[PDB]
Amino acid sequence: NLKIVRMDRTAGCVTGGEEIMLLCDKVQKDDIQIRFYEEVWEGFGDFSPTDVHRQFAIVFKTPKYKDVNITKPASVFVQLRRKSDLETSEPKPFLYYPE
Amino acid sequence: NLKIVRMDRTAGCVTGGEEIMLLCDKVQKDDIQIRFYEEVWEGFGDFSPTDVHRQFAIVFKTPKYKDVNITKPASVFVQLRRKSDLETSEPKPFLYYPE
């Protein structure tokens, strides 16, 4: 089902709050989340249902990473996840960089 | 009809070739173009029908501006335009900056 077709940024500042545009196959705006994770730390993209564009894109802000004092980049994953039954997309790599 | 709902960048290097993601209301992938213009200079976003995502977003590269030697930013407009009958969206401002 779920798929991240493209993201306009695959890296971001460890403090979060940076806007990313993600293109996806069809989602339900009230039953979708963006999960960043590291094998388990997790953080979620910050957006509401109105930031989902006609079920095929999402504009959101990055979560803060677990350690804002990293000295070198921290490799994580990002997936779509349906809130209702926790079905997921295949993950995309994402790099957090030191502030 | 046509509408640019959001763009991930509203500025770009005067040399062009920079990837932008634009969210739009429904378009036909074979009958859509992105027109940058200045009152008339015009340039077009570089993309093919496959870069249009399920009729609701477009990933494209910026055109080169008419003068790559500008010393200060050059304010232009960007609109969607249907190739067949030249119907347009309302324009969005866009700033080209010196290299």
CATH number of B1-99: 2.60.40.10
Tokens of A65: 């990473």
For A31-61, letters b (16+ CB in 10 Å) and e give: ebbbbbbeeeeebebebeeebbbbebbbbbb
Of the candidates B2, B4, B22, the one whose C-alpha atom is nearest the C-alpha of residue B12 is: B22
Main-chain phi, psi angles of B59, to 5 degrees? -105, 130
C-alpha span between A70 and A61 (Å, rounded): 20
Cβ atoms of B90 and B6 closer than 8 Å: no
Q: What is chain A's length? A: 99
Q: Tell which of B3, B22, B56 to mutate to test the A interface (max A CBs under 10 Å).
A: B56
- Residue B92 makes CB contacts below 8 A (sequence gap 6+) with B4, B7, B10, B77, B78, B79
For B24-38, letters b (16+ CB in 10 Å) and e give: beebeeeebbbbbbe
Of the candidates A14, A15, A39, A25, the one whose C-alpha atom is nearest the C-alpha of residue A87 is: A25
DSSP label of A73: -
Cβ atoms of B73 and B37 closer than 8 Å: no
Say if the Cβ atoms of B21 and A25 lie within 8 Å. Answer: no
Pairing, β B74-81 against β B92-97? antiparallel
Interface of B with A in 2-61 (CB under 8 A): 5-6, 8, 19, 21, 23, 25-26, 53-54, 56-57, 59
Resolution expressed in Å: 1.9
Tokens of B30: 């074979």
Q: Identify the residue whose tokens are 């293109």.
A: A23
C-alpha span between B75 and B94 (Å, rounded): 6
- Mapped onto helix, strand or coil, the DSSP state of residue A32 is coil
C-alpha span between B97 and B99 (Å, rounded): 6
DSSP string, chain B: ---EEEES-SEEETT---EEEEEES---TTS-EEEEEE--EEEE-B--GGGEETTTEEEEEPPPPS-TT-SS-EEEEEEEE-TTT--BPPPEEEEEE--
Of the candidates B59, B63, B92, B58, the one whose C-alpha atom is nearest the C-alpha of residue B75 is: B92
C-alpha span between B76 and B93 (Å, rounded): 6
Of the candidates B19, B38, B22, B11, the one whose C-alpha atom is nearest the C-alpha of residue B94 is: B11
